[PDB]
Write a protein that binds this ligand. Structure first.
Ligand SMILES: CC(C)(C)c1ccc(N2C(=O)c3cc(F)ccc3[C@H](CC(=O)O)[C@H]2c2ccc3c(c2)OCCO3)cc1Cl
Ligand SMILES: CC(C)(C)c1ccc(N2C(=O)c3cc(F)ccc3[C@H](CC(=O)O)[C@H]2c2ccc3c(c2)OCCO3)cc1Cl
Ligand SMILES: [Ca+2]
Ligand SMILES: [Ca+2]
Lengths: 164, 169
């Protein structure tokens, strides 16, 4: 099961290191860099987990209601989320980039990995990641996993989690 | 088994992309960017796979007989290898950095991952990675995996000697 190792790496080699000082980085942005009125960036890292493992080049080509806003200071990006043609939220948003391995494996004949195998691994990755973060010290209330399957709205998917 | 996913990621996300173009990068370097009165860099990517999963940050401090030379142009580094205090070879050398996950996990109480669990996973990583590269198109004659278990006795192993043995083959 390839997902097991991907989810551990994602956590241990990345989340474990960026999550402890994430809220301070958002706090600096809100207080000193934010030129947006009433639009404060949310306190959590929103992680996009598409079950089809399709990670685009840039986030905005996937949805026109997701617009790049700034780089989070001190590798992370801030986006504005549109609802009804208006800014409905602002957050630090990204893809769980280890999903690229599952998509690349499904695209390599010698891996013997079908689309059905990919979907199962994608789901397994999400569940293993949920279990790791649940027992993780630095991941108490600063991380949000947005798992989804696909006119679909990626912005409406993020906004529901933001409202939570 | 954490190793299965690490080995696939290492290959599909990295090796598959750098190996096809590697020999041309070394050729250009040797012809246009290398110092005249010095050794030509070897044509393969030498990958260090320590079974204890200890990746050293700065490779030049793991062994004093391994000295940084230059960056390969167009993320890869060139090193000189010393034998008896003299330059015995030059190559593009690196660690299989996904091994860092196995070491970090062994250092995290909540992972329930022992040293014995880590050794088994490093073994499976090497085993999987070898099988992948064996059937892989882009791995022509441009990649060598250097797997090594450091023996209890410090006097019976040298990292530079380990690399030079592969370089000579
Ligand atoms: C489709 C392309 C563009 C080829 C791609 C992109 C990224 C990745 N990566 C991963 O999937 C990956 C997987 C992990 F479990 C941990 C970290 C990464 C990282 C995640 C990241 O960089 O955001 C990465 C990866 C995969 C293999 C590597 C590596 C990095 O760095 C050098 C060693 O091998 C893989 C592919 Cl197939
Ligand atoms: C000990 C420290 C320093 C904390 C460490 C260092 C590297 C890594 N990485 C990996 O182990 C890793 C594992 C993979 F399967 C593929 C690619 C990577 C890459 C390999 C590389 O960068 O050379 C990486 C990794 C691991 C998780 C990631 C990521 C990158 O990029 C962003 C997404 O999550 C992990 C740790 Cl624990
Ligand atoms: Ca010893
Ligand atoms: Ca010693």
């Amino acid at each position: 099961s390839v997902a097991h190792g991907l989810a551990w790496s994602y956590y241990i080699g990345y989340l474990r290191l960026i999550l402890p000082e994430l809220q301070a980085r958002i706090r600096t942005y809100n207080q000193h860099y934010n030129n947006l009125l009433r639009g404060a960036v949310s306190q959590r890292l929103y992680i996009l987990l598409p079950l089809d493992c399709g990670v685009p080049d840039n986030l905005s080509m996937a949805d026109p209601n997701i617009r790049f806003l700034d780089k989070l200071p001190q590798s992370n990006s801030i986006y504005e989320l549109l609802e009804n043609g208006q800014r409905a939220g602002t957050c630090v948003l990204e893809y769980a980039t280890p999903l690229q391995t599952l998509f690349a494996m499904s695209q390599y004949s010698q891996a013997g990995f079908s689309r059905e195998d990919r979907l199962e691994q994608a789901k397994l990755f999400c569940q293993t990641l949920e279990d790791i973060l649940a027992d993780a010290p630095e991941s108490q209330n600063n991380c949000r996993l947005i798992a989804y399957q696909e006119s679909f709205s990626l912005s409406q998917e993020v906004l529901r989690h933001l409202r939570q």
